Every structure is written in C-alpha cells, then in structure tokens.
C-alpha cells in the first residue's frame, strides 16, 4: 500500500524500530509524538534566471522532493526564483517560525545553478555575482540564530555544480 501519507516511502515496522533502539542506546536523536509535532521543511528552487540558462526539469525535482519530505512528515514550504538577498530573507524567516519549537528536525533543500563559491540567485552573472554561500545557510540555522532548533538535526541538501570540471581522470584498465 502506497496511498497513505508516507506514499512510496517504505514504512518502519515497530519490531524493526525497537531493534534499532537496541543496536545503539541513547545515541539516537529523540523523536517527538506524531500527534502534536509540527515538522517543517523548506525547498528553494531557482528555475528562471536573468542571464544564465533555464534549468529545464527542475519541476520534477520540486515535485519529487516536496512529496518525499511530506512522506517523512514535514510541512514543505516551496520558494522559487529568488536572489541571494531574497534567499537570506526567507532563510531568516524560516529560522523564526514557531513550529520549530514543537519539531524534532528540519530539512533545507536548495536547487539552483552553482559555482565554486556558492549557490546562484536568479539575478546572477559573471560581472555581477549573486551568490549564497554554504556558510550563510549554517550561520542562519545555528544555535545563535535559530535557538528553536538547538540539539536537533538540520539536513541541508544542495543540487548544483561546484565548478566547471567534469570531475574525471583516465586510467589503464
């Protein structure tokens, strides 16, 4: 059955769930009551850019990821075609959402063009860079800026190039 809330995500049986709490003791992140908990996720996807080419197919990634994160129990916020300044504002706002207090974890997902230095905002070009740094995301989600998410896993996912190279070398078989 895959018509339920978890969809195509394979369920974890109660026998397997308690056998996982046997392999490792208090070395697992605590999970909140399914009843009361208010899990938040956030996807920022840039498809339409001013100068750099269009990311045809990003919609399938937005669809796929959103559905997956919902299956895992998160309320997915989807944001699109933002500048590095705009992304900061939205990351700042997500860090201020009250639901984190009644949450156990979060997922941040960024899908855009990227360079060696960071993630590209909608208005990016080689002459006028519009870049969000990996550093910025962490800084904005740490204990100083996001105290609600203290002691709770924060999972950041980035789909992007990190440079121009194909990342391959040849060798004799």
């Amino acid at each position: 059955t895959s018509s339920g809330s978890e969809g195509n995500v394979k369920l974890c049986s109660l026998e397997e769930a308690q056998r996982i709490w046997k392999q490792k003791s208090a070395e697992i992140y605590p999970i909140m009551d399914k009843s009361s908990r208010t899990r938040l996720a956030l996807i920022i996807c840039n498809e339409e850019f001013d100068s750099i080419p269009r990311r045809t197919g990003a919609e399938v990634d937005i669809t796929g990821m959103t559905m997956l994160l919902q299956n895992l129990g998160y309320s997915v916020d989807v944001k699109k075609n933002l500048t590095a300044s705009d992304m900061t504002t939205e990351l700042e706002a997500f860090a201020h959402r009250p639901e984190h207090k009644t949450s156990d974890s979060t997922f941040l997902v960024f899908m855009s063009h990227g360079i060696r230095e960071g993630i590209c905002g909608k208005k990016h070009s080689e002459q006028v860079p519009d870049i969000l740094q990996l550093n910025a995301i962490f800084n904005m989600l740490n204990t100083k800026n996001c105290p609600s998410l203290k002691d709770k896993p924060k999972v950041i996912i980035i789909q992007a190039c990190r440079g121009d190279s194909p990342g391959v070398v040849w060798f004799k078989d």
């Binding site: 978890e6 974890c12 045809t56 895992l72 899908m111 204990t143 002691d151 896993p153 996912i157 789909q159």
Partner: protein, 88 residues
Amino acid sequence: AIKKAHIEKDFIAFCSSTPDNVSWRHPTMGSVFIGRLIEHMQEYACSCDVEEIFRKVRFSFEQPDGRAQMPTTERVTLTRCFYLFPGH
C-alpha cells in the same frame, strides 16, 4: 541561570558533487542526484540513519560513465544517529 551551548551542532550537508566539479540534470527526468536521493530515502529511511543513506547514494555513483559526479557530505556535526522512522 544560563548554560553554555555549542553554536554549531547537529548539522549535515549533502552536496550533489565534489568541489570544482559539475552536477548533471536531465530536461524531462530532473537532476540525477535528487532522483537518486529520493529513490534511496524511499527505500532506506526505514532502516538506516541519514549519514548511511548518503553514503549509499554516493555508492550508487561509484561506477562512472558519460556523465560523472560524486556527491559529497559536508560540515557534519551530528553527535547522534538520525533515523527518520517513517510511519512514526
């Protein structure tokens, strides 16, 4: 009173490629990394922690072809295993 806490803790970043290198995307099938991650989460979230799932996603990229990329885990400060316990 006031207690001291680590400023940065309980983080995991999962990138689509090693530094300096590209990440691919099909125009009708979306990004390879994302698709591979969904596939693997769908199949392994019930039994493995997220760190392990990322390692497995990396393992599926082991054998390269016409288009190659090697997903990379960054800035890990998880002090515990994160299990999703799907359905709970």
